[PDB]
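Predict fold of Adenosine receptor A2a; 291 aa.
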Amino acid sequence: SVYITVELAIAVLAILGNVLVCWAVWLNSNLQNVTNYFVVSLAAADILVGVLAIPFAITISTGFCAACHGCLFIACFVLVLAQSSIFSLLAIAIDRYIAIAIPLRYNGLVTGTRAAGIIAICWVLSFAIGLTPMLGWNNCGQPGCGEGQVACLFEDVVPMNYMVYFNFFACVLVPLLLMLGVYLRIFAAARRQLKQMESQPLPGERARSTLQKEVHAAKSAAIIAGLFALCWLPLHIINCFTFFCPDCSHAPLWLMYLAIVLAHTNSVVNPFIYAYRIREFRQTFRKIIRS
Ligand SMILES: Cn1c(=O)c2c(ncn2C)n(C)c1=O
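Predicted 3D structure, encoded as tokens:
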């Protein structure tokens, strides 16, 4: 009951943390910028983790008996939260790029309305993708619980060709490669901005301070994304060995859970990364707790 204990420990933090973030934003209007609209999507997504995803993960670990629709939803619900985080992290990257790249058109393009729109779309696409195995791409009953109910086991009910080709490479590796490519242009151009301002006949510390603060935000965003890939790659890398290399000793269970726990931990690092990186956030939380 140790794995269970740790999974519950995370669920608590994942909730308290991200919920604290959403509350801090709804309280302090200085954090209600268009940018943080996506951060809210990240929070809500990472909240349902300690709310449903973890509970489901703890249940499916031992396996149970249920229909295909019910057994798939429970097993593929984590793919939805993990996929939504992809769109949110990708949007934030693009956003932090638009600001530094074209500061003027930033307010003209990056609107509070389009934000809510994109988010909605992202979630829809998250359910479409995350629950693709429920569209027919599954191994329900492929060569106990009785007729009608199927032994709900993640590896047995969920195809490997999906989580590898479709899910991992396309819906994870590609995005992360796009995001990484974005931050490449972000910091590459950001340092050029400082070089042009390094050869200016005027102080203009307003533009420098602002530029440095926009870079501080883009950097903080880069750290949030990095921890995502750092906490999900291991779990996918394991599935790459199992699939592509049937000979390669199938990953043990003790190692399997560690990769799974590492993914559920990702939802917790965010609340703490804001309180540290952003001096505006930490002062917001500090107040809520006291009062
Ligand atoms: C992504 N993933 C897995 O790849 C997995 C798993 N249990 C077993 N495997 C293989 N769980 C709960 C999971 O979330």
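Residues 121 and 156 are 31 Å apart (CA to CA).
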